[PDB]
Design an enzyme around this catalytic site. Sequence first.
Site, short mmCIF file in Angstrom:
data_model
loop_
_atom_site.label_atom_id
_atom_site.label_comp_id
_atom_site.label_asym_id
_atom_site.label_seq_id
_atom_site.Cartn_x
_atom_site.Cartn_y
_atom_site.Cartn_z
N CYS A 1 0.85 -1.19 0.00
CA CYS A 1 0.00 0.00 0.00
C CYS A 1 0.87 1.22 0.00
CB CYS A 1 -0.87 -0.02 1.24
SG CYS A 1 -2.03 1.35 1.38
N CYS B 1 -1.92 1.95 -2.67
CA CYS B 1 -2.83 3.04 -2.23
C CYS B 1 -2.13 4.39 -2.24
CB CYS B 1 -3.45 2.80 -0.85
SG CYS B 1 -3.47 1.11 -0.20
N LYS C 1 -0.67 5.55 -5.68
CA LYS C 1 -1.83 5.52 -6.56
C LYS C 1 -2.71 6.76 -6.37
CE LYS C 1 -5.50 3.93 -5.13
NZ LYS C 1 -6.25 2.72 -5.51
N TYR D 1 -9.32 -3.32 -11.15
CA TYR D 1 -9.35 -1.96 -10.63
C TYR D 1 -7.98 -1.34 -10.86
CZ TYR D 1 -7.06 -3.08 -6.20
OH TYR D 1 -6.16 -3.44 -5.19
N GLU E 1 -7.80 2.30 -12.84
CA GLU E 1 -7.22 3.44 -12.13
C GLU E 1 -5.92 3.95 -12.81
OE1 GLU E 1 -6.36 2.22 -8.08
OE2 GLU E 1 -8.56 2.30 -7.47
N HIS F 1 -26.71 20.29 2.27
CA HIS F 1 -26.91 20.93 0.99
C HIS F 1 -26.00 22.14 0.86
CE1 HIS F 1 -28.90 22.19 -2.61
NE2 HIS F 1 -29.29 23.33 -2.07
N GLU G 1 -26.00 13.96 -0.24
CA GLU G 1 -27.44 14.13 0.04
C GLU G 1 -28.41 13.36 -0.89
OE1 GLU G 1 -29.43 17.97 -0.12
OE2 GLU G 1 -27.90 18.77 -1.51
C1 LIG Z 1 -2.10 -0.62 -7.27
C2 LIG Z 1 -2.77 -0.97 -5.99
C3 LIG Z 1 -3.61 -0.06 -5.39
C4 LIG Z 1 -4.31 -0.39 -4.23
N1 LIG Z 1 -5.07 0.52 -3.67
C5 LIG Z 1 -5.72 0.31 -2.58
C6 LIG Z 1 -6.58 1.30 -2.00
O1 LIG Z 1 -6.74 2.43 -2.48
N2 LIG Z 1 -7.19 1.02 -0.87
C7 LIG Z 1 -7.06 -0.12 -0.21
O2 LIG Z 1 -7.69 -0.33 0.88
N3 LIG Z 1 -6.24 -1.04 -0.73
C8 LIG Z 1 -5.59 -0.90 -1.88
N4 LIG Z 1 -4.80 -1.93 -2.39
C9 LIG Z 1 -4.73 -3.17 -1.61
C10 LIG Z 1 -3.77 -3.02 -0.48
O3 LIG Z 1 -2.59 -2.51 -1.08
C11 LIG Z 1 -3.54 -4.39 0.12
O4 LIG Z 1 -4.82 -4.87 0.50
C12 LIG Z 1 -2.64 -4.36 1.34
O5 LIG Z 1 -1.37 -3.91 0.94
C13 LIG Z 1 -2.39 -5.74 1.93
O6 LIG Z 1 -1.60 -5.68 3.09
P1 LIG Z 1 -0.92 -7.04 3.53
O7 LIG Z 1 -0.22 -6.70 4.85
O8 LIG Z 1 -1.89 -8.16 3.55
O9 LIG Z 1 0.05 -7.40 2.29
P2 LIG Z 1 1.27 -6.45 1.86
O10 LIG Z 1 1.16 -5.00 2.26
O11 LIG Z 1 1.75 -6.54 0.50
O12 LIG Z 1 2.42 -7.07 2.81
C14 LIG Z 1 3.36 -8.07 2.38
C15 LIG Z 1 4.82 -7.68 2.59
O13 LIG Z 1 5.56 -8.89 2.84
C16 LIG Z 1 6.69 -9.02 1.99
N5 LIG Z 1 6.98 -10.48 1.88
C17 LIG Z 1 6.44 -11.37 1.03
N6 LIG Z 1 6.92 -12.64 1.22
C18 LIG Z 1 7.77 -12.55 2.24
C19 LIG Z 1 8.58 -13.54 2.97
N7 LIG Z 1 8.53 -14.82 2.61
N8 LIG Z 1 9.33 -13.09 3.95
C20 LIG Z 1 9.34 -11.76 4.31
N9 LIG Z 1 8.62 -10.79 3.70
C21 LIG Z 1 7.82 -11.14 2.67
C22 LIG Z 1 6.25 -8.24 0.79
O14 LIG Z 1 7.42 -7.83 0.13
C23 LIG Z 1 5.47 -7.08 1.38
O15 LIG Z 1 6.25 -5.96 1.77
C24 LIG Z 1 -4.10 -1.69 -3.59
C25 LIG Z 1 -3.19 -2.59 -4.18
C26 LIG Z 1 -2.56 -2.27 -5.36
C27 LIG Z 1 -1.65 -3.27 -6.00
#
Ligand SMILES: Cc1cc2nc3c(=O)[nH]c(=O)nc-3n(C[C@H](O)[C@H](O)[C@H](O)COP(=O)(O)OP(=O)(O)OC[C@H]3O[C@@H](n4cnc5c(N)ncnc54)[C@H](O)[C@@H]3O)c2cc1C
Length: 584
Positions: free
Chosen positions: A150, A155, A158, A290, A294, A564, A569
């Site tokens: 994110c 997010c 973006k 999405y 976007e 308003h 609304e």
């Molecule tokens: C372009 C885009 C726009 C988005 N926009 C929105 C939005 O506007 N609003 C919204 O609510 N959500 C949005 N999302 C979704 C949101 O980004 C995700 O839902 C959120 O990041 C998920 O968090 P997480 O902790 O589950 O996974 P992540 O934040 O991705 O956490 C995973 C982390 O673990 C690391 N990792 C992976 N495997 C390993 C391992 N084996 N050992 C150690 N580290 C590891 C990864 O590198 C990463 O840093 C968007 C996603 C994208 C791609």
Amino acid sequence: SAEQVEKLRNKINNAAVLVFAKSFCPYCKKVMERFNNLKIPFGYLDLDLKKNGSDYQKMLQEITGRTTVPQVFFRGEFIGGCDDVMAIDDDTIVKKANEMKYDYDMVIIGGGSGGLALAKESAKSGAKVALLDFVVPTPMGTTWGLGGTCVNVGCIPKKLMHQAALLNHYMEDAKSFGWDVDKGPHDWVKMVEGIQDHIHALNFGYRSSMMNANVKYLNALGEIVDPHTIKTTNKQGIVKNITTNTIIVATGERPRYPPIPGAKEYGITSDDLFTLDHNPGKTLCVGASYVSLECAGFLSSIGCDVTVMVRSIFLRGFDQQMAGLISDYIAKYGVKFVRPCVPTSVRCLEEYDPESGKLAIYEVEGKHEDGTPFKDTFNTVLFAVGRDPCTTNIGLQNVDVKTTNGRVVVDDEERTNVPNIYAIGDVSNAGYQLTPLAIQAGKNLARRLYTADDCRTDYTNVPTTVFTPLEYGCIGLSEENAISKFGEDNIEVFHSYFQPLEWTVPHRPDNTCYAKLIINKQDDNRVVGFHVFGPNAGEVTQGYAVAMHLGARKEDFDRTIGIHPTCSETFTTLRVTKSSGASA
Ligand SMILES: Cc1cc2nc3c(=O)[nH]c(=O)nc-3n(C[C@H](O)[C@H](O)[C@H](O)COP(=O)(O)OP(=O)(O)OC[C@H]3O[C@@H](n4cnc5c(N)ncnc54)[C@H](O)[C@@H]3O)c2cc1C
Ligand SMILES: [Au+]
């Protein structure tokens, strides 16, 4: 009871230092103050603020044999009431509250939205916790700091690009409002520097937080070897096993590439776009998700020549009417669509030259269904097809944690088939893949693990918004899905096209912005769906999610007086139904 007692035992043992407490009770004060004085990190639960807090009082007497609170545990060993804790020395208590067995109480695999949140919240309630995060770089080379998808590559960047795109139109509007504005070209690089500044400050802020809470941030790749041990492998190449009581998987997803010549070697994804050196130039987005729309959306308004290649329909899984209106608009204001098409090749005709400012060109091929052939030429190919859960390569085979479609299967407390391995945010098979939901999942689990609370996270009535040039927010069911779930006979849909006041002076199309409520007439005219398409959809929509949790019906919207002039609304005044046929 019975089943409930054992559930509490299980939490007590898998906690760290744990005090059952009450607000108005004197002695609980004494114990906690002593623990603060000796830097002993613990995690309380004020039975007085619960309302099933009575059960707990009785349940604890089953376990310990003591009547009142306070009741203290050191990782599952009952230490006693107040007069018990005081009889143990200042030295030997500190020792006792550290006896561990394992290196950590919790190891979190992944330092994204969820991991970071789970991590800070658990350390607040006394856990000794390790947070692994390592970003495996993209085929192209790209890498980021702590924070997850994110913060770095979703997010945050973006919505910033979006805001850059939105201002483009705002400046065209300002002439109607009386401003003499010429407005000049858009420098892409200057934007990406200030975006990348903000992401760097967030990288820092999250690293800082973990440090100030006693979370051990390890910049290394996690992998499970067995239910109480994970294998860490670091930036250098090193290996190092660490042990833990609890393992949380929280590894998020990564962009999917399709399986065609040139995908990885010449395309890019979201991971790369937000940090690009140069203008992306004439760009092609593959996919109708999405992310694709976007991205397409804000590149177009920034000046770029965007084309979007769609396999079949737009935003599969969202209300197909609203998706229609998102695409239609996007199309009215410049985005070229090619549909149905999938690409079949990417091939590189020319090179990029920093010496001396001039973009690569790729020839992309596609089958135009019937099919005629497709062949055109772009500067950037952006694959925005899907995202794959990060579950291969974490040793899930070693503990046999159950999966489905690649996602880690979990129960309603975010737990897997092996009872000390949990999974949260996107890898799980719970919920929409969103940040606030990754966060709240983790904040609540922290409190179950390390305060013995029962608060579960609610995966119903989740609001969402897609940040297309005109935004679409939604809660609840789509029209199609409510129809097929409750029956055509039982649902009425109320709708209206409208115009923000802010668009009347600038003569921008009327009746484009649009609102509909989906109603289940059988359940007292319950609102089971909310959809809005227009500016600030995210803001408009957040508050109605609460009303939906409280079971809003149609009459509940109509009794609410509106504000308003606001776009929102319109939901307080809706009259025209779809079954009537009347124009909206
Ligand atoms: C372009 C885009 C726009 C988005 N926009 C929105 C939005 O506007 N609003 C919204 O609510 N959500 C949005 N999302 C979704 C949101 O980004 C995700 O839902 C959120 O990041 C998920 O968090 P997480 O902790 O589950 O996974 P992540 O934040 O991705 O956490 C995973 C982390 O673990 C690391 N990792 C992976 N495997 C390993 C391992 N084996 N050992 C150690 N580290 C590891 C990864 O590198 C990463 O840093 C968007 C996603 C994208 C791609
Ligand atoms: Au509006």
